[PDB]
Design a protein around this ligand. Sequence first.
Ligand SMILES: [Zn+2]
Ligand SMILES: [Zn+2]
Lengths: 344, 344
Amino acid sequence: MTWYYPPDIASDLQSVNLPAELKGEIFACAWEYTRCVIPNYTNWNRYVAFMRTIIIGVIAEFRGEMVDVTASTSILGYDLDGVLAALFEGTPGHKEMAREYKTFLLITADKASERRDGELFRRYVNALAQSPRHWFRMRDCDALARFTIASALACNDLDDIWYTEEQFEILTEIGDTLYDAVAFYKHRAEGETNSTFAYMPEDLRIKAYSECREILWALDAAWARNPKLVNVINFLRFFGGPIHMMMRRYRFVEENLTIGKRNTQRYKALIGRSEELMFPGLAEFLEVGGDGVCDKCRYRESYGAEVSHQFGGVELCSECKLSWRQYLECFVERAADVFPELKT
Amino acid sequence: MTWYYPPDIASDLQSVNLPAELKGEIFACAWEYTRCVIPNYTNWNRYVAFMRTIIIGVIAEFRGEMVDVTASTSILGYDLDGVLAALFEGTPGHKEMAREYKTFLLITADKASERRDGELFRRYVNALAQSPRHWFRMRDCDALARFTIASALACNDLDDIWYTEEQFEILTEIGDTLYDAVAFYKHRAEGETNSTFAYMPEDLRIKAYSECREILWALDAAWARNPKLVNVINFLRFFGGPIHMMMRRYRFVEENLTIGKRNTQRYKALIGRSEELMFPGLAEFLEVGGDGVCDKCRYRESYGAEVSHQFGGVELCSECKLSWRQYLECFVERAADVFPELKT
Ligand SMILES: [Zn+2]
Ligand SMILES: [Zn+2]
């Protein structure tokens, strides 16, 4: 197995205790991901800064104990704030994107470690299920979807382009619905907490892909001859399933070129650091939703024990399933309301 | 069904006898294809010129009688030489890319019409099977692979970038092998003449995808921080299977988000117009290979009668299968010989 990546990152992770062959595979993963979801760039330095955010994120998912965003010490030989500044300085969402990424590192590492049985992760998983709109916002951060939209703009020196909160909500809902519709079978086999059709109706998965893809084509056509905005469309289009064919980390080849088959002290200290570590509104999502808002849904005391061939989070009750069904079934009108260019 | 495409092409095909709903679908097809395989552009006018070459090509595949490149009259309300000049003027391969495209229109229309039982198509199909290297060169033109590499450079105002013949041969072999490995089952059901694994061994299809994809990653890494060359890589990567998920013309949604389940007078007149209508070397390919070079392979008197659930071209004999196997099995070394950056 031979790993391909630019030499700029070949001497990263100095004194990180992983074998050289594993660092090679991580660097390859970062480069492949970056080339797939930000396929164009003008700013090599920002591109490499993005690659390093993906390096850290891959290790956080693999061995959560290795990545502690709560500690002031270097992350994996990097200066996290420095890397984020190299990526985002002079761009409209720098401060919010640092919060987005640190949230992703906090939750991801907690999940890929012994902290998975902890109170932060327990409240996170409960808060995912409090409403379909909360789900899409939290899934966004978990997938770095708006982070990567922001990164795609930054990496093309588009330092003036930005979206409202509601616009990001719809753009990431498109990207995340597309990805999660395709990642469905993998996610179910692995006992995933963060998979859209663990919550949304299975009998609308195919239609959801089809509608998200069509609205993405309609947006693309409505943004024609502003080639700035193609970096946003391209992200959603290549992220939204196609990465399963392009990245060696997925199993397209292995499946024969087929697709388809209570101590609350740390938690309170982290809520206290919400402006630093949590995306805007997450502290309220965790405080309001962390114990489970609905008396009929099935919560668990902990989400650490890893289940298989079923989703590992909250099980929605009948009434919640219907509300989530109804939210999915008005996707087009929710999209058209924030992107009125779709009305025509 | 709603069609999305830029308004620049909305009034194309004036006085072309197709219903408005079908023109809409063609315009959508052209826009979707263009956005998928040339996902970045700087030159809107060249981008629209490319879209129009795809408009003409889609109609040529659908109703070959509607598109005659041999006649001096307008093609479908366009001036073909004008569109090609808008796309390619000032670029290194303008003259050769006009020949590439006119070949594609000649063969495609012949195939999608009554001329499919004709001597040109009979000699074309025989010439496909004369050697594996001939196959990849002819498949390239049939897929507009080097045409689209050239177009991807042009559409990004990269007017100085070019490849040797041998480099184009390997780049298109990568793109065409990737696409044909994925399009395998569709191609077989339709009785396709132009499908790589109708000729190359079925038992190497999975490995061929895997090796082409890896060499494409190795090239990508070897071309790092020359962001010019990402337009070439991106073409091959998105063309090489991912379009099956992104373009509404494919059936990803319809399959539930799954992948995997003798009058020689005209012929002699066209050989006489080879500098105009045929890519460099095709006239020799047709003259030398048109009657079938191997006495053991199975040729047909005509390839017009359309077969189903099997390939519709030449059936290679034992000895030819082995030579084709051996050519496929030395892909990496053939690639490394023309792109020595891969040696490291
Ligand atoms: Zn409930
Ligand atoms: Zn033979």
